[PDB]
C-alpha cells in the first residue's frame, strides 16, 4: 500500500497499453515485478481467490524476482513484469473476460510472473550443445521451460512464507497447477506453429463460421458453449501467454526499440561464447560484428509475430497492437537508407 511516490507515479496508467515499463524499471531499481505484481494481483483479486495474505504474496514476488538474473539484458525481471502487463491487458479484453473463468485468470497472471525465472540468458539449444546441468537434467527437452515452472514450484511450496497456494483446497490446486505448467511450457519455441495452428483451426475458423449465421441469441449460446470448453480454454491460454511473451513488437516505438536492443545484445553474448568455446553456432546471424538489428527485427516479425498476432487480433480485437506493429515494422524498414 505505502509505495514511494516515483514508483507510485510509474504505475498510474497500467490498464493502458502504452505503459512506461522502463521508467518503472528505473524507479524500482530493477524490482518492477514485485511492485507491478502487487498492484495487478490486488486489482484482479488474486489473494482473495487463493486465500493468501498480502504478506505471503509479497514474499512470493520477492523470491521469484530475486531468481531473475539482473545481468541478463533481456531475460530479467523487467521482461517478466512486461509480460505480466500484456497478460493483464489481454484478460481485461471483452472476449477473454466472457470466455475465461477466474481460475484461468489466476493461472495466466502467475504464469507470466514465473515463466522465465532463473533464465541464464542462453537458449535451450546452447544448453544442449554445451551439455549444461539443466540439459542433462531435462534430457534436452524443453530445457528452460521445464526449469522455470519447476523451480517456481520449488521456491513457492518449499517455504511456508512463500506458499501462496497453501490455503487452497485439494482439487483447486491440482487444476491451477496444471494450468500454470501448461502456460509456462507453451512458451517453448519449437511448439510455436503447432500452438498457432491449433488456435486458428479450433477457434478462429469455427468462430468465423458461426458468425456468418447472424447475431441470434440462440447462436451466441452455441458460440459461448463452443469456446468455453476445457480444451478450447487451454488453447486460448496458450495463445494469450505466447502473445504476451513476445508482445514487444506491438509496443510504442520507443519501447519496441529498447526490447530489440536487449534481446539482440543477449544473443550476441551467446554467439561470442559459442565461438570462444568452440560450440556450434546456432544463431549465426546474431553476431555483434555482422548483425543488422533492423533487418533481423523484420525477419523476426515476419516469421513469428505477424500470423500469430493476426490470429490473436482476429479473436480478441487488438487495434492498438496492430497499429503499433505496423508503425514499428515501417520504422525498421525506413532505417535502411541504402
Ligand atoms: N524482438 C525480438 N526479437 C527477437 Cl530476435 N527475439 C525476440 C524478440 N522478442 C522476444 N524474442 C525472443 C524470441 C526469439 C525467437 C523466437 C521467439 O518465439 C516466441 C515463441 F515461439 F517461443 C521468441
Ligand atoms: Mg522462456
Ligand atoms: Zn519470456
UniProtKB/Swiss-Prot annotation:
The active site is at 75 (proton donor). Expressed in most tissues except thymus and peripheral blood leukocytes. Highest levels in testis, ovary, small intestine and colon. A divalent metal cation 2 binds at residue 116. A divalent metal cation 1 binds at residues 79, 115-116, 245. Changing residue 267 to F: Increases sensitivity to several nonselective or family selective PDE inhibitors. Residues 1-338 form the PDEase domain. It comes from the Eukaryota. Composed of a C-terminal catalytic domain containing two putative divalent metal sites and an N-terminal regulatory domain. Belongs to the cyclic nucleotide phosphodiesterase family. PDE8 subfamily. Hydrolyzes the second messenger cAMP, which is a key regulator of many important physiological processes. May be involved in maintaining basal levels of the cyclic nucleotide and/or in the cAMP regulation of germ cell development. Binding to RAF1 reduces RAF1 'Ser-259' inhibitory-phosphorylation and stimulates RAF1-dependent EGF-activated ERK-signaling. Protects against cell death induced by hydrogen peroxide and staurosporine. Interacts with RAF1. The interaction promotes RAF1 activity. This is High affinity cAMP-specific and IBMX-insensitive 3',5'-cyclic phosphodiesterase 8A. It comes from Homo sapiens. The chain holds residues 482 to 819 of 829 of the full protein.
